Design goal:
By secondary structure, the protein is mostly helical. The protein has 4 helices and no strands. It is found in: Secreted. This is C5a anaphylatoxin.
Length: 63
Amino acid sequence: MLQKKIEEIAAKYKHSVVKKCCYDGACVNNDETCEQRAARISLGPRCIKAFTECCVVASQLRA
């Protein structure tokens, strides 16, 4: 559309993994430790790490 929406769109595609793998990683789960949950991941390290970091961090902020 107009020159910001442009970037607005193309951003959507940058670091897509980190972006996502992080979100799930943060999203609450008190039935499982991060470790357990990250074991179930199938998208390899980047996602894995991503996911983890965010989880652990978030949780701790939940403290």
